[PDB]
């Protein structure tokens, strides 16, 4: 069975001695000593510690030195990490380290000869211990108050962001709220200790998202002083002090100090096996007639739309145990063996015995390829009775019987002593019959439940001695909010009441004209004969409460306002029209600056980003959300009716947009709104580069790469106006064409190539080996390196392009003897932050325009539909001038003052008007704090968070403390909502911050936080909240399928679920959410477990699930993840 280590071909000497190359092989299977590595989990993968490469390399150094690690105080420099390594659950991975002992260089390769890491390392000769000094401001008389972050508090906030660090790596013991001071635990492992140091850096306040290392500038370890710096706690364990100084960008800990440890963003890779189940919770009648009749669209004979599960369900919770033996006759043709193994597998508490029986062995053949996967017991059977037992199913195209043909039917069930449990009549003559055949009844107990006191509880705890009172029926005539339905599911499978036949009857008339609920008479028995476990009643229909799957469509809206942003970095199949935050509100303040787009143009960055070639880390400006970040040019009309053309820091690709005083210009009577929509970026970019920054003077020489391009054409035009020697390069024959035509002043000496390095030669000829005065480079690696060489003496390098910069490539520092000057040029850096320098750039455009210098570029114009395509097109350098997106056929001839009528298919994303205030009870709670954060991001300026004691944790202090520094208005309240006087106090508290637009009930302890609070808030909210947008409540599937030991948690929840359905009927917002296990910070972890046959939803999933739910019609919806 087990196969063992066979020394391999490549295992014995194969060249000669080299005290300077090492291969390290790493096994991660639980046996290996290097199993500790599995605790460096990140986003779900086990990635080799960036820190590890340093360790490897360091080891390697001392090897070559004949020394051991503890004797080789090491120094690193300019280390770069390039890719990281993804350790597989099993097998080995190899990493080689090579060492250039004179260059002091080094470099780490993987098995595939890939570049993993590189820099300089060497023995530190004069190890100065004064470097790792841990001294303070002064004497802080500040303990027993203070507020620090607990080891738990830390890796909690991290695992939130994406860092699934495991136990062996959780070495941050304690930490200053700001992440500037703390204590790291010694592990007798540098891989860990070092990576913890990184932790601390990553742990800035307000810093979000997923960040790995990428560059260090100067690591410096001295195990000699590291021993001395270390200490022993009372725990007996070991640790030392760690300090972060983000003004100096150094982290220090024990005997190791990092200097300049830049890190950077990575993409979270959704693992589509954790896609949560989204169900709606409509009431469903047992008497559904005229069903369907909406489907525009065999498909006709086969009716699998929702009302199949509608009864399968009813039938399923009508037995004590979540185990159901199902069978089906006439199976090969009317194929039910394909559906219900999916309808039951949907729920998280299933135990399925399916049986597929056909008269012949023949029809059970297309099934061997199916019944195999479905796990269905097959056989032989013909409708003549003899049977070789919970439900039986059949398609003709006291358990349960589902049937489907295509009055006479209803008397063929009266003979077999069946009661029509369910009836689904289709518009086209397809009817569904469920049937339950009843075994004589027992002592039918009856207890109503409307009294607030909960007196019936010592009443029901008494009905548990009764040996076998088969019919035990709970009911409530008073409260239209009785929470029985939920109560039931909890008891219906709690040991004592297992076979209790726990039934229920409820009165939820939703309109005032809708009475009809009298017992002891006629209908008390109509519902007792059907025996259905759950019997509810709304305005005249007798049905139970069923869970149907969700309609799935990412809710769209009819908007005058939308912008477009890649739903996933790197792939343009998820480019969509996103509801713009002007669609939620527009304060007089931001309002005069509003402006409607006719054309929006792509620029290179819009591309490279939607790609993933350029990180969002290289984009100037400080960013709330690094998401919505695409589009910077547009043309249209401001609220003046006037006719403008301009730039925008981001979100430019849109219907509508907010101008920037200092970067909007009036578009000339003689320019189509199209041509206009190409000018800004390009010439702005050109002038900032040639004139302002390079100081290009007349009769100087300039090499402008890719004049074929947009920025190129502009660059050329401008350099011609001060009449200089032009040298442009170009990819395509036809691009030589265009340019030659357009700029006539161009010789053939002007043109070189761009696919190539050839242009250096070409430029050195007609330059007489003299070179050019300014180069406007926007080109690759070897090509930039070659452009640097076309530099004449005293000349200037204008660096636009960002690829080489972004990768910290090297520049040959001796180009600087030519008295050359080298210019890094990002117009982004100006632009928004609209300084003096920029105003200068703008007035070169203003002037240039009025002197003909600046002119519209050729446009390739895509309709507002084919937007995707517009990208792929600009992707391929197969264009000449700007690629432009038309959003509004422009207004024609005779002077048209217009008023636009735009209807757009815009996807819904919840956004907060910045004048409204939002209230979250249980607001400092693990999950509350996150809804708080998430609310802010979607734009909330005013938060009222509720807690009993106020702020007690460090991690609570931190969030709130920050949100106030970010300028969010946050009021921590000690007010409780289960008292109308308290509720009014709260809703009033919020109203001071501004009109209340959001109320989220998260408080939980039982039926005072949840039921009584929900109730009050409903009232107060009605009375005096005319601007309320959202009204949300957090349930739990405890009320759903049921939990043993929380029948009290259950009642309280189902209750809120009624008051929501109220508000819905009444045209108000309302929404209860039945959550499965809630993960990262719920009451659970405080993430691999299995509570209630499910899985802890990662809060991140929750929050985006909330997005979806918040913009839905239905009152109650469920969201949980499946176990197995």
């Amino acid at each position: 069975s087990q196969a063992w280590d066979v020394p391999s071909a490549a295992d014995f000497p194969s060249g000669s001695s080299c005290s300077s190359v090492a291969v390290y092989k790493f096994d991660v299977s639980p046996e290996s000593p290097d199993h500790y590595l599995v605790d460096h989990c990140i986003d779900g993968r086990v990635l080799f510690p960036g820190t590890g490469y340093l360790w490897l390399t360091w080891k390697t150094l001392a090897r070559a030195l004949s020394q051991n690690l503890e004797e080789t105080p090491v120094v690193f420099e300019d280390v770069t990490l390039h890719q990281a390594t993804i350790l597989p659950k099993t097998g080995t991975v190899s990493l080689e380290v090579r060492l250039l002992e004179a260059s002091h260089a080094f470099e780490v390769s993987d098995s595939n000869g890939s570049l993993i890491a590189s820099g300089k390392v060497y023995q530190w000769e004069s190890p100065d211990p004064k470097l790792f000094d841990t001294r303070a401001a002064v004497d802080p008389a500040d303990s027993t108050a203070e507020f620090r972050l607990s080891q738990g508090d830390v890796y909690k906030d991290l695992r939130l962001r994406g860092y699934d660090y495991g136990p062996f790596f959780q070495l941050v013991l304690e930490s200053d709220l700001e992440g500037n001071r703390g204590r790291l635990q010694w592990n007798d492992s540098w891989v860990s200790f070092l990576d913890a140091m990184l932790h601390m850096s990553i742990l800035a306040p307000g810093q979000l998202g997923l960040y790995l290392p990428t560059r260090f500038t100067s690591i410096r370890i001295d195990p000699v002083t590291h021993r001395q710096k270390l200490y022993t706690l009372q725990d007996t364990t070991q640790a030392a002090d760690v300090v972060v100084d983000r003004n100096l960008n150094t982290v220090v800990a024990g005997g190791a100090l990092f200097l300049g440890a830049h890190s950077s963003v990575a993409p979270r890779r959704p693992q589509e096996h954790l896609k949560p189940i989204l169900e709606k919770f409509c009431f469903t009648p047992h008497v559904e007639s005229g069903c369907l009749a909406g489907n525009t669209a065999l498909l006709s004979g086969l009716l699998d739309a929702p009302a199949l599960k509608a009864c399968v369900d009813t039938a399923l919770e009508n037995m004590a145990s979540p185990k159901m033996k199902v069978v089906e006759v006439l199976a090969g043709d009317g194929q039910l063996y394909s559906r219900i193994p999916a309808l039951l597998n949907t729920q998280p508490v299933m135990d399925l015995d399916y049986t597929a029986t056909d008269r012949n062995p023949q029809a059970l053949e297309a099934a061997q390829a199916k019944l195999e996967q479905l796990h269905v017991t097959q056989g032989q059977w013909d409708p003549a009775n003899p049977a070789p037992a919970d439900l039986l199913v059949c398609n003709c195209a006291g358990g349960f019987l589902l049937l489907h043909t295509l009055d006479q039917w209803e008397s063929l069930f009266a003979g077999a002593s069946l009661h029509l449990v369910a009836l689904k009549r289709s518009f086209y003559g397809s009817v569904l019959f469920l049937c339950r055949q009843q075994t004589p009844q027992d002592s039918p107990v009856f207890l109503s439940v409307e009294d607030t006191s909960f007196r019936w509880v010592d009443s029901l705890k008494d009905i548990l001695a009764d040996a076998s009172s088969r019919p035990v029926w709970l009911m409530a005539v008073g409260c239209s909010t009785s929470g029985v339905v939920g109560m039931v599911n909890c008891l219906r499978k709690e040991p004592g009441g297992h076979r209790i036949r726990c039934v229920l009857v409820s009165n939820l008339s939703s309109t005032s004209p809708a009475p009809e609920m009298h017992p002891s008479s006629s209908e008390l028995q109509k519902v007792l004969q059907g025996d259905l476990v759950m019997n509810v009643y709304r305005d005249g229909a007798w049905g139970a409460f069923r869970h149907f799957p969700l309609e799935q469509d990412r809710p769209e809206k009819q908007t005058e306002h939308a912008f477009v942003n890649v739903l996933s970095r790197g792939d343009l199949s998820s480019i969509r029209w996103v509801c713009s935050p002007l669609h939620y509100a527009l304060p007089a303040s931001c309002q005069d600056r509003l402006c409607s787009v006719y054309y929006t143009s792509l620029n290179f960055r819009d591309v490279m980003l939607a790609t993933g070639k350029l990180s969002p880390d290289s984009i100037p400006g400080k960013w709330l959300t690094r998401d919505c970040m695409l589009g910077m040019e547009f043309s249209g009309r401001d609220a003046s009716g006037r006719r403008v053309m301009g730039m925008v820091p981001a979100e430019g690709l849109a219907t509508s947009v907010l101008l920037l005083q200092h970067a909007t210009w009036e578009v000339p009577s003689t320019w189509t709104l199209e041509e206009a929509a190409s000018v800004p970026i390009v010439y702005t970019t050109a002038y900032y580069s040639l004139v302002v920054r390079g100081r290009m003077q007349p009769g100087e020489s300039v090499l402008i790469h890719s004049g074929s391009g947009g920025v190129g054409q502009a660059a050329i035009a401008i350099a011609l106006s001060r009449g200089c020697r032009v040298f442009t390069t170009v990819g395509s024959a036809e691009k030589r064409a265009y340019l030659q035509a357009r700029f006539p002043q161009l010789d053939e000496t002007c043109f070189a190539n761009s696919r190539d390095t050839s242009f250096e030669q070409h430029v050195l000829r007609h330059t007489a080996g003299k070179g050019v005065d300014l180069v406007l480079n926007s080109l690759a690696e070897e090509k930039l390196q070659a452009s640097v060489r076309c530099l004449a003496q005293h000349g200037r390098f204008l660096e636009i392009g960002k690829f080489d910069l972004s990768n910290n490539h090297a520049l040959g520092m001796a180009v600087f003897l030519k008295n050359v000057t080298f210019h890094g040029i990002l117009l982004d850096s100006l632009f928004e932050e609209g300084g003096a320098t920029w105003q200068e750039v703008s007035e070169l455009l203003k002037a240039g325009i009025q002197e003909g210098v600046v002119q519209p570029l050729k446009c390739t114009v895509f309709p507002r539909t084919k937007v995707e395509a517009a990208f792929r097109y600009m992707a391929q350098g197969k264009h000449i001038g700007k690629v432009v997106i038309q959003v509004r056929e422009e207004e024609q001839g005779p002077a048209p003052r217009g008023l636009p009528p735009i209807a757009l298919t815009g996807l819904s994303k919840t956004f907060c008007p910045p004048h409204k205030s939002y209230v979250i009870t249980g607001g400092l709670g693990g999950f509350g704090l996150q809804l708080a954060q998430w609310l802010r991001l979607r734009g909330a300026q005013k938060l009222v968070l509720t807690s009993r004691s106020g702020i007690r944790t460090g991690y609570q202090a931190r969030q709130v403390r920050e949100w106030r520094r970010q300028g969010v208005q946050v009021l921590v309240s000690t007010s409780n909502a289960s008292s109308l006087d308290g509720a009014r106090s709260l809703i009033t508290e919020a109203t001071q911050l501004g009109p209340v637009g959001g109320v989220f009930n998260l408080a939980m302890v039982v039926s005072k936080p949840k039921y009584s609070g929900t109730a009050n808030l409903d009232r107060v909210t009605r009375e005096a909240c005319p601007e309320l947008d959202y009204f949300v409540i957090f349930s739990s599937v405890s009320c759903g399928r049921g939990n043993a030991g929380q029948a009290n948690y259950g009642f309280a929840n189902s209750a809120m679920e009624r008051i929501c359905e109220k508000r819905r009927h009444d045209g108000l917002p309302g929404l209860a959410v039945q959550w499965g296990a809630i993960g990262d910070v719920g009451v659970v972890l405080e993430n691999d477990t299995v509570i209630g046959g499910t899985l802890p939803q990662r809060i991140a999933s929750c929050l985006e699930v909330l997005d979806l739910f918040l913009s839905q019609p239905h009152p109650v919806l469920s969201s949980f993840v499946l176990a197995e």
């Binding site: 063992w4 280590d5 066979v6 020394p7 071909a9 295992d11 014995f12 000497p13």
Partner: protein, 279 residues
């Protein structure tokens, strides 16, 4: 402690069990015996492999690689309290182990023995040395006897046989009539040169006046390397010693042509081919 075991030793421990029970004896019956173990082993490659990385590689690999263990650890597990020995004589070895044991049994010492031969080809450098001495066949084959003989073609094997006194054998493949070894003196033509004039002597010492009748030989298994120089030297001195007799005396052949020169295992690998056919 197993992943740091030389695979020879791994599959030796198995074959020599597979071998003892091959002869109808339950191994345990030998536990505590004055029974012994002789191993013909020339190449312990696995040994060096797990002896380089002086932080990686563990200290008890040597209880699982050090040549002495090819026998010492076979003696260990089977509880053979008699002589435990490894011999190295290049290609000869395993046969000379089988000689050495026979002699030990013959004269009291033991009641039975484990004769083993082992050769596993792990490091290519080894072959590379051989090729540079020309003894490896580029053709990659053992042209036993044929003229197209370049050189030989190295092959691996673990093989083992159980010797015993007849008054104790539940099964007998054959009986050993004689055996002995000498050593090509000092040849003028170099050390690698097979001295057929000496091999001739060795073959006489064991027949005519001092042993069996050269006429009874039905088959002789040759070393049969396939050397352009070896082959002739051997087969010559063979007849030059075994043939004053009628009929087609010895039908001759080599297993090394069927499978490759198993080097120090060669001897016993061959014996097996013989015994196999006899049956």
């Amino acid at each position: 402690q197993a992943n740091t075991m030389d695979p020879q030793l791994r599959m030796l421990l198995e074959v020599t069990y597979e071998a003892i029970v091959d002869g109808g004896i339950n191994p345990a019956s030998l536990r505590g015996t004055s029974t012994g173990v002789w191993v013909g082993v020339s190449s312990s490659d696995a040994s060096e492999a797990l002896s380089r990385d002086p932080e990686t590689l563990v200290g008890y690999s040597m209880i699982g690689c050090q040549r002495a263990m090819m026998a010492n650890r076979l003696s260990f597990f089977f509880d053979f309290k008699g002589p435990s020995i490894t011999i190295d004589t290049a290609c000869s070895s395993s046969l000379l182990a089988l000689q050495s044991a026979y002699q030990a049994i013959r004269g009291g010492e033991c009641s039975a023995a484990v004769v083993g031969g082992l050769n596993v080809l792990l490091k290519p450098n080894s072959s590379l040395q051989f090729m540079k001495l020309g003894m490896l066949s580029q053709d990659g084959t053992c042209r036993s006897f044929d003229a197209e003989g370049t050189g030989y073609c190295r092959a691996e094997a673990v093989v083992a046989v159980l010797l015993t006194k007849k008054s104790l054998a539940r099964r007998v493949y054959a009986t050993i009539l004689n055996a002995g070894t000498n050593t090509d003196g000092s040849k003028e033509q170099g050390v690698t040169f097979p001295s057929g004039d000496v091999q001739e002597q060795l073959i006489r010492s064991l027949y005519a006046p001092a042993g069996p009748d050269p006429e009874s030989l039905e088959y002789i298994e040759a070393h049969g390397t396939g050397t352009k120089v070896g082959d002739p030297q051997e087969l010559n001195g063979i007849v030059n010693a075994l043939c004053a007799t009628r009929r087609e005396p010895l039908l001759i052949g080599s297993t090394k042509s069927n499978m490759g020169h198993p080097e120090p295992a060669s001897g016993v690998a061959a014996l097996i081919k013989v015994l196999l056919s006899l049956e």
